Amino acid sequence: LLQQLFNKFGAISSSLQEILSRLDPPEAQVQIDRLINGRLTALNAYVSQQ
Amino acid sequence: INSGTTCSNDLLYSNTEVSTGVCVNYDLYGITGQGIFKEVSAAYYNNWQ
Amino acid sequence: DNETLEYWVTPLSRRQYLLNFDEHGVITNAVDCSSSFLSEIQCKTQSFA
Predict the structure, then answer these.
(1) After which residues is chain A broken (C to N over 2.5 A)?
(2) For burial by CB atoms within 10 Å, which of A9, A26, B33, C24 has the most?
(3) What is the annotated role of this protein in its UniProt record (chain B)?
(4) Structural gaps in chain C: residues followed by a C–N separation over 2.5 Å
(5) Does B touch A (3+ CB pairs < 8 Å)?
(6) CA distances in angstroms from A49 to A44, A46, B44, listed in the order given
């Protein structure tokens, strides 16, 4: 579950610090949304297994 | 990006001290973040690291 | 006086390895991840044993 915080899920980086120090607010959101969807999917699967 | 010695001098500041033991922001030569430093000894660094 | 000249050359390519780092930061061990089946197991477990 901790190794899911270092996948990109099709974004430019796995790090939220690296995205918010390179892109403007209209274009950082498109990258942040992909990380949010991947991490919510991983939490959903963990809760189903528990 | 965000590492090295080709630094833009638009936003100017002054060199502070590395305050160990407090939750500080840092911009160490382009490397940015929030953290807590601790002074230590370290033999693993060469002259290129 | 029975000496020899040696210059061994082999090509390079872009590929994934698993590297091992000790307490001095020295590369002790390496494995090419696509060379054999044991190396597939080693790179899949991220482990040298």
Answers:
(1) none
(2) A9
(3) Attaches the virion to the cell membrane by interacting with host receptor, initiating the infection.
(4) none
(5) yes
(6) 9, 5, 42
